[PDB]
Design a protein around this ligand. Sequence first.
Ligand SMILES: NC(c1ccccc1)c1ccccc1
Ligand SMILES: [Zn+2]
Ligand SMILES: [Zn+2]
Length: 582
Amino acid sequence: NLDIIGKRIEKIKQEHETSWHYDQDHPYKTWAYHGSYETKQTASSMVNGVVRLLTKPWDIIPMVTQMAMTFKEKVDTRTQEPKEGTKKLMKITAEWLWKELGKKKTPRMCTREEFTRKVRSNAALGAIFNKWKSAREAVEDSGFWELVDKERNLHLEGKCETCVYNMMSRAIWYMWLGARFLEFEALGFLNEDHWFSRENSLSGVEGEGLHKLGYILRDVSKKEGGAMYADDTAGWDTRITLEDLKNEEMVTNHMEGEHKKLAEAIFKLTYQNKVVRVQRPTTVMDIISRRDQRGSGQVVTYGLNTFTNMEAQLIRQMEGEGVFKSIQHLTVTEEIAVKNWLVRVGRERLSRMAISGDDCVVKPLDDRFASALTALNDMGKVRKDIQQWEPSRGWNDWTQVPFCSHHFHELIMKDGRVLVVPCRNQDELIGRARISQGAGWSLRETACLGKSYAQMWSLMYFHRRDLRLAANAICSAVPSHWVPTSRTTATHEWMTTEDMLTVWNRVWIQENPWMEDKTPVESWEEIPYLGKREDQWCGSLIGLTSRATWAKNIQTAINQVRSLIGNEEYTDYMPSMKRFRR
Ligand SMILES: NC(c1ccccc1)c1ccccc1
Ligand SMILES: [Zn+2]
Ligand SMILES: [Zn+2]
């Protein structure tokens, strides 16, 4: 408790000595409260006018238009201690999983040099603005690195002064850039060196890309076994126990020297003991602590969520296969049985899963998995929108399974080759492309963000009639040589000024390991759509009068946007589609 968090608490006390007050009307039950201090401040979603002018039929669809308008009674909940049998299953499984993940990888420190390059090309490293403006400026000033040095030597000493979270089914924990550096130095190797790639982790999909995920689910479907299960956890980050944080820390057992000590300090000082500042309107700033739940950078959060989810799902598979009888307590021979299962079939069981942080698909040996709930519930990974003890409903067809907010279609090209394509309700795709985040967007920057959405649609969603047409329209309306942008950046092959047919060929044919015949496609007309009825089922306006008028008059919409942007060099992409090819 207060010996580890005191210094951080003591330090904040003094910067607001003219405001400190142990409030008695404090709303916290499960967060330990420490004091308050005076503040006053808040970014809402702005509309992308280039995308909206080229998607007029959607201006009257509430599921689209409502997306641009506008649980902290779940951050303040508590998760019970698992039973001794559960704690044992988790420790055995975690020990075994870090060893498998480490067989072909070497833990290593990430560098100031590497950190500097990331900030100078904009990755969402959730930092705060103070002493320097942007992260870009802090990183080119030795003063910063002297602050980093002081904290670093403090961590080697087993103490923390400045690693404090700022809080804002979502809650995002910003830290100052220096704390983010020290987290990246110690734990960045998990993401930088692809520990959760499918090749390395067998269940993982890190780096895979939306054009790969469907093929991966189809490969899992080919295994003998029961239904495919895709149970969502209710508020995964809030259900991470101190026991979970201690099994995650066992990655430090694979480290050495300075690195081992630096990583141990991140886990002890910042993860297993946390200090947070929260805005309360009654506007004060509350300084609260707790030992459990997930609060890390979003990139480390992803890798450790994947790890703990892989562990939880192997244990649920063990329960279904009868490897252990009860979570209350493991006998000695049950320990040897669990160990033996892991050594004997562990890698086969990992290959039966697709796991992306808190999101999973599992194809177990059989449907006993559906009612194997005791370990899952006792670890605190309670399923969303189903009663605690009601058996999971599985999916019989891999094309119906939800994963990473998508489902996947099998689409046969006129030439017989097979594409497995990502899909989601088209209102969600149009509604998201119509939104920009933050202020000070020029017309050119707004146009380049529209172009990023358009090129993503041409690569991932070409099979949706409305999206291939709208993508072609946006790419016709934005100057040909302007570079697609995004202020928050899976693999992003659409972020390029290369011709999109050449990128399509590279992604779907040349580099696609499931495509034996490498014959290039010569035009967009060779590239198929979903069935017309399947397109409607997934939200296509195809067959409406509004959509027919939009399609027929599309050059008029393109010319409206070209007139606003001004006298620039444009390309007409509409004749790449049969109906505008004269
Ligand atoms: N004629 C339309 C239709 C026919 C039958 C069912 C649904 C739409 C149609 C099809 C494909 C593209 C554009 C319009
Ligand atoms: Zn610190
Ligand atoms: Zn679909």
